[PDB]
Design a protein around this nucleic acid. Structure first.
Lengths: 46, 271
RNA sequence: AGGACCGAACCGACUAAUGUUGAAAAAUUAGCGGAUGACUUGUGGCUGGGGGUGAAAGGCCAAUCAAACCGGGAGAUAGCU
RNA sequence: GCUCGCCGGAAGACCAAGGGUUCCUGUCCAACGUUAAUCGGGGCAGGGUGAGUCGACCCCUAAGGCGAGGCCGAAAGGCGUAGUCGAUGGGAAACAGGUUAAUAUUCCUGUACUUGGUGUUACUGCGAAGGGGGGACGGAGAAGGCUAUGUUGGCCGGGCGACGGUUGUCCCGGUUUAAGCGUGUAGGCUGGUUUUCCAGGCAAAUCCGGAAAAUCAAGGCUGAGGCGUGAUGACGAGGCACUACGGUGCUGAAGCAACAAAUGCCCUGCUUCCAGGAAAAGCCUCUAAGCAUCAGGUAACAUCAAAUCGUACCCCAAACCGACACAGGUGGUCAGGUAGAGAAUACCAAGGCGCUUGAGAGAACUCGGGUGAAGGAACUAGGCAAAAUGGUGCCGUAACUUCGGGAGAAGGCACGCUGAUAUGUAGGUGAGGUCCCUCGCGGAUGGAGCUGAAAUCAGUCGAAGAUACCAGCUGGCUGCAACUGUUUAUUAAAAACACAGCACUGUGCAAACACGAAAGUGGACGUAUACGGUGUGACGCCUGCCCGGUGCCGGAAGGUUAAUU
RNA sequence: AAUUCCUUGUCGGGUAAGUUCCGACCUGCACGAAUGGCGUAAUGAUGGCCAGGCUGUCUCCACCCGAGACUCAGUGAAAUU
């Protein structure tokens, strides 16, 4: 049976990449929250 | 010619085809072609705005000349062609100077016929002149509404217009819908009718034929749930309300013309 | 010639048995339907929650849908256990 | 190591996606492996990925995204022009052999090819963000000509049989070779060259398009395969010597023909139909502004340059998605033998495996199968399940019907092997020879050799000859829906939803309508034979009566009635 | 009647025996003409009924071939309380 997660690197970066987060006001607020919390990995870049 | 297919299988019993051997059996004129991508009834917001649109056969757009502003240069018809973007056919013409263009095919035009446009043009089918120089009571097609922008009326398969009177700078016309409209006596019009009269006698014969045209199936509305359509549902087939669109409009007599901007070029709207 | 006929790949899911702390949070075995088309499939793209999409079942929208998920108002209110 | 069993259109081989050292060698057995473990995709250490030609980057664009100014919007922000990004598509070049414990079209040997820069010589009209050509495109069907590949014969090497026979019409094995370069065939398309003129291609133009003459018909383009060369080479079954019995030096015979034949190639072709089938650059041409003893352009030779990143391994699976070493899911490529219509099915080749608990016993009962006396649906809500029918050719076939169907209706007969007709027939393929020629990959004639159906007659074995696998039960009456299709992923596949057809009604274009505070976009680069909404639902015969109520469409005399004054 | 409460309406067909099925009758509780009426060849993993063939479905079960169940060695769960 086909499951929900079908990996694809190209789509992963275009949907949740660093540059995708910096392209909108709301996306830049996601990074600000994660920086304040101290996350070691801000995005899924690599 | 109208041809009825034999019932060799279900889906062919009721098929009626219109065949015209005069059409060109070859590729069209490349220089007068353009890309035409499908939309699916969706606008720049990505939402569906017109339903029942989707799929179909790939098509290319033919650049047709609706203005006919080349005066004083006779042209000769080369061949008739099939146009997928419209119900009527088109004709490829060649001017003396060596230019080619596409025009709507009149009723009785063939290969080799001569056409011309201008004030001094002859009164023959295929010629375009301002309505000021056209006699009253004659039949025309591809009528301009404002001088210089190109024809917009009577462009379908077998449509035409009739000039009924000429009072001043305006001419009164009877449209195919029966409406009495008047436009300025400076708009160009083409003599004759658009010849595809047999286009109305075709019978698709099966559901798949409609899908080839890009038409998607229509759901009635009385078969839906109340949350989806005013006609809603019910135990069985109830329908105890007045007919109505989605979004709540009558659909059974309620007029919806609310322009009020022109309100002068209409006399005998219809019926 | 054909939304034509028989039938593998491929796409579906009508019947029975098994399984039901299963091999599997929907499968296996034996039969079954379509199979040049309103067909099927790879890669990428667009439509966002009182909104989308829907050959229309209140179906589907990340194992969740008569109003998704995450955080916040929030220690909502509970004449009831 | 010797046997046995299983897969073989995969359970074999090579990749993309995804994973990220799982790859190779040495060493270790606590934990991990559903048991033991000396073993492992486990622990520890070392080693391994070599490119001008493969891919990425790069040049070009599709859907779509972003978007200087701009338009619009309380703020945030939305749309969009010039532009700039975006493959799943277009765009230059390498083949065979050898080699490592682990990489190679990347290293080695042999033999090739492509695009640029600089320089020399000779001859010269060069020049763009512009014009034209080209790139450039659908479905189905029909053959013909070929190759991959297979079979047999010939040839070369070896063999004479654990038990009757086996010096022959006997047995086993091999019989292989590329890109490139030259030739330009089967076949496809198009009539050529010359001169003058012209409201067109945003200006120009020798180019494209158009018009009028003259002169010849042989001109050109495209094109699988074959042949030659590459190759006095490489490879090569088997021998002879090192020899830790793990392997390398040296040497090495034959290397031809016929027939059969693709879903691959000629073919982006040809024929035909309606639903009428991407874009841009590279590339080939034409000139403008400009520059001409320069600069640039064409050809030959020499020389230099071609960077950077990926390359191990798994990839229908124990390494990816499912919490697992999980009977599930996952796109592309390669396609041997006998029988067969076949990529079905049965047994096999190359190759790969026996699925990570075993040993005994031979109770009830459960699961998956085989057979059955007499009866044959008496079972049961119901023939659920099971049994049964099953192939090819010929004969034959009802009611009804929209004349196509119903129909494979139903039903009946014949099927193996051997010999002859015919020491292998009809047919297919086609050598030598003879003659001719525009002598060439030519044509006519010619028939050797090879290959090979079906039918009839006679004989013969068994209980049974479509013997295995494979492979329709059939008929009569009737409700509903015309039909092919669609639907509750995970208890409902239907009489429900679609449907062609029919009717009513709205809409004259800045259309109605829909998404949007707006701009704007879809409808549509469409124009009433068009588009939206609603009901009905092929086709045939038909669709009656009622406008009081509610809605919708018209009408003006009167009464009543808002803000305002 | 996919519509009929009374109801297994009444008569005929089929069966030794038919609340179902088929054909008529009309007392249509409560059919009816595009939320269409009545017919209709072909089609259907659609509903009901009757025959031929066929059989372990059954009268009524018997034997046999395999995988578990049982014994030995290794590893070693769960609901509940």
């Amino acid at each position: 049976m086909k499951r929900t997660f079908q990996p694809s690197v190209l789509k992963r970066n275009r949907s949740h990449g660093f540059r995708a987060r910096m392209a909108t006001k709301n996306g830049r607020q996601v990074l600000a929250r994660r920086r304040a919390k101290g996350r070691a990995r801000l995005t899924v870049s690599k | 010619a109208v041809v009825k297919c034999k019932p060799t299988s279900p889906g062919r019993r009721h098929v009626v085809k219109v065949v015209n051997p005069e059409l060109h059996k070859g590729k069209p004129f490349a220089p007068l072609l353009e890309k035409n991508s499908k939309s699916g009834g969706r606008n720049n917001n990505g939402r569906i705005t017109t339903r029942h649109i989707g799929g179909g056969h790939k098509q290319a757009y033919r650049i047709v000349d609706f203005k006919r502003n080349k005066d004083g240069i006779p042209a000769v018809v080369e061949r008739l062609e099939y146009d997928p973007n419209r119900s009527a056919n088109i004709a490829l013409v060649l001017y003396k100077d060596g230019e080619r263009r596409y025009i709507l095919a009149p009723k009785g035009l063939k290969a080799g016929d001569q056409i011309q446009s201008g004030v001094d043009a002859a009164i023959k089918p295929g010629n375009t002149l301002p309505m000021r120089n056209i006699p009253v009571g004659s039949t025309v097609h591809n009528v301009e509404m404002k001088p210089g922008k190109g024809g917009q009326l009577a462009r379908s398969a077998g449509t035409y217009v009739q000039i009924v009177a000429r009072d001043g700078a305006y001419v009164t016309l009877r449209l195919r819908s029966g409406e009495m409209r008047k436009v300025e006596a400076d708009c160009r019009a083409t003599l004759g009718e658009v010849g595809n009269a047999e286009h109305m006698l075709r019978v698709l014969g099966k559901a798949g034929a409609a899908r080839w045209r890009g038409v998607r199936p229509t759901v009635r509305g009385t078969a839906m749930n109340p949350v989806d359509h005013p006609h809603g549902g019910g135990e069985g087939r109830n329908f105890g309300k007045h007919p109505v669109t989605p979004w709540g409009v009558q659909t059974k007599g309620k007029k919806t013309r609310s322009n009020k901007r022109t309100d002068k070029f209409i006399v005998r709207r219809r019926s």
